[PDB]
Amino acid sequence: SEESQAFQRQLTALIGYDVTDVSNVHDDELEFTRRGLVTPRMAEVASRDPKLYAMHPWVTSKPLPEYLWKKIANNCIFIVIHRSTTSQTIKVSPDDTPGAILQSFFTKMAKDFVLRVCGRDEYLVGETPIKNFQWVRHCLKNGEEIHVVLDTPPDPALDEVRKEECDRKFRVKIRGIDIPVLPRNTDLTVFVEANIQHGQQVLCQRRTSPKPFTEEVLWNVWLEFSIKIKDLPKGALLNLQIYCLLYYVNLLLIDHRFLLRRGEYVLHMWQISGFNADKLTSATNPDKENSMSISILLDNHPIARAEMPNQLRKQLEAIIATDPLNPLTAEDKELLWHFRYESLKHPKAYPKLFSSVKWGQQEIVAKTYQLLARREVWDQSALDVGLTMQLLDCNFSDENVRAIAVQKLESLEDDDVLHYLLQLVQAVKFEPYHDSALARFLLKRGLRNKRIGHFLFWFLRSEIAQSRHYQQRFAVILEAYLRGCGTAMLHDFTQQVQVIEMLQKVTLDIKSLSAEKYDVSSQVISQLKQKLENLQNSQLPESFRVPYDPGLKAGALAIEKCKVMASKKKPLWLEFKCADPTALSNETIGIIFKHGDDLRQDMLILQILRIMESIWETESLDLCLLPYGCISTGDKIGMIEIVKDATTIAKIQQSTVGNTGAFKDEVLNHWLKEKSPTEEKFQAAVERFVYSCAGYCVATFVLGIGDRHNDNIMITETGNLFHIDFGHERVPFVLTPDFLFVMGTSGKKTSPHFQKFQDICVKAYLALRHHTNLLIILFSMMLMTGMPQLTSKEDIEYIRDALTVGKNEEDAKKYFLDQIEVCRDKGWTVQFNWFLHLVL
């Protein structure tokens, strides 16, 4: 139909890639998948409650932590309801529902509707004990009053959805390589390596002979693999590689229809930058012009008791106990396999067990499947996310293994889904096939809830715009989403996209106009001011959802407040008015637009920071981290939330002390005193400081991103410290002397506030260690799916030592309390060292 052709144009500009394009394809997986995703979408689109969907109450079922009970010191909670500009305060108990507040409010006003948060597309509707709304817990945490406007349900009709309706050795032939142009070196050596791979396990490996490197190289050979054909497991990849390692490509041996892949192939290959999730994609390089290729033939047909000695069970359990990064011995593996049934009784053994499987042997895979049908124990154990993540990583390519993980996720409530979304999305990179339990889990959840839907979009779009290796897959999932999210939401994404394409334009042009000489010359403030007033009228939408806080609808530029940093990269600092007239305040929405850093990295780190916070909640800690909004929009470009009322420790050192790397120790306290209206808010600032410092000291050590310059650390006027710019002699973390004179210490001393700081770290630290497995897998996934290129040992195995795996609680505290001492030891050594190696 005519309409649907133009609607596809829509989808394409929203997505930033064209999924009807079939230029870069050698089979029909993507298309089969676009058609596969229809059912599960229409399903959830058929399933959701239109009313609750439209208002998307952000809700939890977690208990309220202790640090916020000490804030309702009376089983009573105040709510300021507004009408036009008339208002009154209501007496409410934590457990009261949104329903049981209306019936009370109209028994509180004598001579149906819906409550909504002031200045936000946010609502308190539905049957949950209002102590269980996030916006409420946010007010408490930050000492705030809960303001609401009385309006109706947003018409549940506004999310109207548009309607739709055997026993031979495997053999492979290397014809040869081609590269149209390759003057890449004085010539060395070149051979081809064909690996049969399952879950990063090399099942089998044959090579070619070493020739010199010409723009055209031939062999015409059958490589005989040891594996029989009947023995290939679904999702095995034939993995093809060129060493002189220079190029790679991958072909799924078995297709999405369980068919043995037969025939002729010309595969355009990816280059290593002159281990890593890109190394894994089944996608061929779409740049058919410059790219190396390879030509192959496939002529080869679908797919076909309790007794235990003590010393073994002890060895078994010792193996099962150990961390996710401890290597399994061959003996270890045979132990797990032969006692697979005793192993099945322990959820925690699943990763190790399934990685003890000889996947290149058919009758064993078959035994593994028969095993997976005794899933009573797995099905009935509580949901361990770190367990579940492990089964979704690069080590498992089996469909059924992976499905039992996706099973466990189903019981996740939106609140938690949102905590893991980013990493669940990156985890699609490890799926063998475009259609998977996990890709479909993401749809479902995303379509069931607007908050997850929104983040689903930007997370998927972030990679679509930026990586060739996975743009196609993600673009099919993204497509599938947009076709379900409903008319309203499409409208928002549409104007969200237009605003950021516009503002990036401006970001790039401004960056071009200034030299290495960083000044912000009157001439550049000229350019910026003018560009924005031009944009303000006939181009820039009236208002837009702030991508990283979908509650906030942003309005007009505050042109006078927009500026540019005095820096080699030249980021915009942009500020916006709030489209919502019911907004309680008049404070601007701040967004930094920046080109230069890989913000994908920032996204990953930031989101672990939240996970960490949530981990701390489980033990009633609060460490006042400030994980500001950050989104990758495309290649080394993106946006960042402006944190209001903060500067850099560096600037606080430029102010009173000067600028040639000079350093003095009292200034932090001076600055803090001077930004506190009463010496009491000041107290609250020192207290903010001790807690926020401590948090970042711990988080930062665990992730090994703690050796930072002061210019990359910030504080709010209310004492909230926070690390920034996760761009990319040593020291564990940053506990400088200037920080210390706020603790009350002078190199040696130990004041009630310092004792406190040491207290809180140890508390925070060995609390992360209670979640060790989770953090290890997250970190390891982070590394593989979001960094430069990282070693299958040295890099990942940093976090083992940091979380001091294997150690008793006792050593652990001792270990951390000494890291502190290395800071106490060196003070300003490395800080100053930045400007030392300005010229060396």
Positive or negative CA dihedral for 380, 384, 388, 391?
A: negative
- What CA–CA distance (Å, rounded) separates 411 from 416? 10
Shortest distance, CB of residue 590 to ligand 039, whole angstroms? 6
Considering only residues 337-376, where is the footprint of ligand 039 by CB under 6 A?
Answer: none
Shortest distance, CB of residue 518 to ligand 039, whole angstroms? 12
For ligand 039 (CB under 6 A), the number of binding residues is 17
Shortest distance, CB of residue 705 to ligand 039, whole angstroms? 15
Q: Which is nearer to ligand 039, 189 or 567 (CB)?
A: 567
> Does 651 sit near ligand 039 (CB under 6 A)?
yes
Q: Which is nearer to ligand 039, 591 or 796 (CB)?
A: 591
Binding segment for ligand 039 (CB under 6 A), chosen from 242-250, 254-262, 635-643, 788-796, is 635-643
How far is it between the farthest Cα atoms of the chain?
93
Q: Which is nearer to ligand 039, 148 or 721 (CB)?
A: 721
Candidate list 277, 385, 646, 768; residue touching ligand 039; CB under 6 A: 646
Q: What is the Rg, in whole angstroms, of the alpha carbon atoms belonging to the chain? A: 29
In total, the chain counts a number of residues equal to 840
Q: Which two tokens stand for residue 811?
A: 């050593």
Q: Which is nearer to ligand 039, 398 or 641 (CB)?
A: 641
- What CA–CA distance (Å, rounded) separates 497 from 541? 10
Candidate list 326, 648, 669, 792; residue touching ligand 039; CB under 6 A: 648
Shortest distance, CB of residue 651 to ligand 039, whole angstroms? 4
Binding segment for ligand 039 (CB under 6 A), chosen from 215-223, 551-559, 637-645, 762-770, is 637-645
Q: Decide if 170 contacts 228 (C-beta within 8 A).
A: yes
Shortest distance, CB of residue 599 to ligand 039, whole angstroms? 11
Candidate list 481, 628, 682, 696; residue touching ligand 039; CB under 6 A: 628
Shortest distance, CB of residue 282 to ligand 039, whole angstroms? 37
Hey, which bits of 134-267 come out as E strands?
Answer: 146-151, 169-178, 191-198, 201-207, 216-228, 237-243, 247-252, 263-266
- Residue 788 DSSP label: S
For residue 454, give the nearest of 532, 370, 544 by alpha carbon: 544
Type of residue at 514: S
Considering only residues 404-463, where is the footprint of ligand 039 by CB under 6 A?
Answer: none
Q: Which two tokens stand for residue 697?
A: 């000291």
Q: Which residues are annotated as a binding site for ATP?
A: 590-599, 625-633, 722-728
- What CA–CA distance (Å, rounded) separates 757 from 739? 11
Shortest distance, CB of residue 592 to ligand 039, whole angstroms? 4
Shortest distance, CB of residue 616 to ligand 039, whole angstroms? 22
Q: Which is nearer to ligand 039, 276 or 710 (CB)?
A: 710
Binding segment for ligand 039 (CB under 6 A), chosen from 83-91, 192-200, 359-367, 562-570, is 562-570
Candidate list 90, 182, 559, 565; residue touching ligand 039; CB under 6 A: 565
Query: Half-sphere exposure of residue 802, counting CA atoms within 13 Å on the CB side?
Result: 23
Shortest distance, CB of residue 514 to ligand 039, whole angstroms? 13
Considering only residues 568-627, where is the footprint of ligand 039 by CB under 6 A?
Answer: 571-573, 592
Q: Which is nearer to ligand 039, 458 or 593 (CB)?
A: 593
Candidate list 48, 211, 563, 763; residue touching ligand 039; CB under 6 A: 563
> Does 684 sit near ligand 039 (CB under 6 A)?
no
CB atoms within 10 A of CB 1: 6
Q: Which residues are annotated as a binding site?
A: 590-599, 625-633, 722-728
Binding segment for ligand 039 (CB under 6 A), chosen from 116-124, 561-569, 770-778, 810-818, is 561-569
Shortest distance, CB of residue 708 to ligand 039, whole angstroms? 13
Q: Which is nearer to ligand 039, 592 or 768 (CB)?
A: 592
Q: Decide if 609 contacts 627 (C-beta within 8 A).
A: yes
Q: Which two tokens stand for residue 345?
A: 């009784």
Shortest distance, CB of residue 624 to ligand 039, whole angstroms? 16
Candidate list 194, 237, 724, 781; residue touching ligand 039; CB under 6 A: 724
- End-to-end alpha-carbon separation of the chain, Å? 66
Q: Decide if 415 contacts 134 (C-beta within 8 A).
A: yes
Q: Which is nearer to ligand 039, 480 or 672 (CB)?
A: 672
Shortest distance, CB of residue 560 to ligand 039, whole angstroms? 14
Q: Decide if 548 contacts 629 (C-beta within 8 A).
A: yes
Beta-carbon contacts of 816 under 8 Å, excluding residues fewer than 6 positions away, are 701, 761, 762, 765
Give CA separation, 476 vs 331, 380, 578, 648, 786, in Å: 43, 34, 34, 42, 21
Binding segment for ligand 039 (CB under 6 A), chosen from 130-138, 546-554, 563-571, 670-678, is 563-571
Q: Which is nearer to ligand 039, 204 or 714 (CB)?
A: 714
Nearest-CB residue to ligand 039? Answer: 573
Question: Taking the mean position of all CA atoms in its chain, how far away is CA 600?
Answer: 8
Residue given tokens 């009313």 in the structure block: 51
Shortest distance, CB of residue 401 to ligand 039, whole angstroms? 40
Q: Which is nearer to ligand 039, 4 or 521 (CB)?
A: 521
Q: Which is nearer to ligand 039, 275 or 573 (CB)?
A: 573
- What CA–CA distance (Å, rounded) separates 169 from 392? 30
- What CA–CA distance (Å, rounded) separates 240 from 271? 12
Beta-carbon contacts of 14 under 8 Å, excluding residues fewer than 6 positions away, are 482, 490, 493, 494, 497
Binding segment for ligand 039 (CB under 6 A), chosen from 244-252, 254-262, 642-650, 819-827, is 642-650
- What CA–CA distance (Å, rounded) separates 44 from 551? 23
For residue 439, give the nearest of 423, 422, 427, 457 by alpha carbon: 427
- What CA–CA distance (Å, rounded) separates 393 from 379? 20
> Does 681 sit near ligand 039 (CB under 6 A)?
no
Candidate list 37, 394, 642, 685; residue touching ligand 039; CB under 6 A: 642
Which three-class secondary structure state does DSSP give residue 221? strand
Q: Which is nearer to ligand 039, 564 or 599 (CB)?
A: 564
Q: Decide if 79 contacts 92 (C-beta within 8 A).
A: yes
Measured torsion, CA atoms of residues 469, 475, 478, 484, in degrees rounded to the nearest 10: -150
Q: Which is nearer to ligand 039, 463 or 641 (CB)?
A: 641
Beta-carbon contacts of 171 under 8 Å, excluding residues fewer than 6 positions away, are 222, 223, 224, 225, 299, 300
Q: Which is nearer to ligand 039, 82 or 563 (CB)?
A: 563
Q: Which two tokens stand for residue 97?
A: 């529902």
Shortest distance, CB of residue 575 to ligand 039, whole angstroms? 10
Candidate list 161, 513, 643, 790; residue touching ligand 039; CB under 6 A: 643
Q: Exposed/middle/buried for 70, CB within 10 Å: 0-12, 13-18, 19+?
A: exposed
Which residues contact ligand 039 (rule: CB under 6 A)? 563-565, 571-573, 592, 628, 640-643, 646-648, 651, 724
